[PDB]
Structure formats: structure tokens, C-alpha cells
């Protein structure tokens, strides 16, 4: 509707001011991601202005999955062994789409 | 109440499985962050198993921040100048901290 629309708008305007001046210093996404250390991923999506790329990840599990693996253990079985954080996670994962799809609305 | 009983305790369990593993490997906070990417302060709320640390940012907010930032641009003038992109981060922050209120009761 009406909001959504106007927020759409916006991110795409902003994802523009992000790569002009990135442009202008002549720098690629992984050179800012290098200085940065933010995200290949979450770069492309600010520049492109993309809400649920944005707002669907739930963070904080793909935080544990990464270091889980970096430390060589197996993260799915990990949080599958700590059954309220997982539930919980799905939980915010699901609040998180439902939230997008109200917007539109 | 009970849900989040489970849920804090498992988060603390969980944290020490990731602090065991880290310091047989000797390594530090700062050694993973180097080598994942993973912020220092994530990693720190993943070991002391604090959702709240974990869940209440609008992880897009910071990545936009630090982006501008980086780029020599102020940050908070730019999303001031995006008044519906401001709104809903307040909003999405407002309801992380909702949504942890109510795990609670």
C-alpha cells in the first residue's frame, strides 16, 4: 500500500547513494567488505534497496552456524541439541516474514 | 516463565560449548573474529548466551551505518533524509524488544 510503497522508493534511493559514492572512489562491494568486514550479502542488499534480504535473516543463528563451523563442529546438530533456541529461532524467522507480508498490506 | 527458562538456560549451555571448543584450540575472541568476519560482539553474546544482545538489533540499521560511515558520509542525517526507512528501523527495533518482553511472561 501506500507506506510500503514510499519505503520501497526510499531503499532504492539509498541503495543508489550507497554505490555513487562507492563508484566515485572506484572501489567493488568486496573492497568495502574488506575494510568493513559487513557482509558481501548485506552490501548488495543495501545497494539494492531489497527490505527482505534486509530484515529476514535471524542474525544471530547464522552468527552460531558460522562460528560452529569454524570450529569444525557441526552446527545444524548443535542447535537441533538446544531444541528452545531452535524453536525460538523459527519463531523470529516466521515474525520476521509475517512482519514484510503486513507491510504490504 | 517457563519457555524462557529453557530458553536462557540452553543459550548459556550452548555458549559454553562454543567457549570450550574455541579455548582447546587456544584461540581468542579476537583470532575468531579475524577469521570469520563474525563481529567481536556477536561472538561475545554468543559465548555469555544473551539473547537479547542477540536479537535486538536491526542488524540492516548498523550495516548502513557502518557502510556510511566508511564512505565519509553521515549516517544519521542520511537515513534522517529517509524518513520511511527510519520509521520502520524504529518500528522492527521496537518490536525485538517487544518480542523479548513477551518470552518472558
Redesign the interface.
Given at each position: 500500500g501506500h507506506?510500503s510503497e514510499?519505503?520501497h522508493k526510499?531503499?532504492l534511493?539509498?541503495g543508489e547513494?550507497?554505490r555513487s559514492?562507492?563508484e566515485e572512489?572506484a572501489l567493488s562491494l568486496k573492497d568495502?567488505e574488506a575494510?568493513?568486514?559487513?557482509?558481501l550479502s548485506?552490501?548488495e542488499?543495501?545497494e539494492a534497496g531489497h527490505l527482505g534480504k534486509?530484515?529476514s535473516?535471524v542474525?544471530?543463528q547464522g552468527?552460531?552456524k558460522?562460528?560452529?563451523a569454524?570450529?569444525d563442529?557441526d552446527g545444524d546438530r548443535?542447535?537441533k541439541e538446544?531444541?528452545?533456541?531452535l524453536k525460538?529461532f523459527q519463531e523470529?524467522s516466521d515474525?520476521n516474514m509475517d512482519?514484510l507480508l503486513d507491510?504490504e498490506s
Open positions: 507506506m514510499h519505503v526510499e531503499l534511493h539509498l547513494v550507497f559514492q562507492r572512489r568495502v575494510a568493513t568486514s559487513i557482509r548485506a552490501l542488499a543495501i534486509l530484515i535473516p542474525y544471530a552468527f552460531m558460522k562460528y560452529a569454524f570450529l563442529m548443535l542447535l538446544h531444541p528452545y533456541v525460538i523470529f515474525q512482519m507491510l
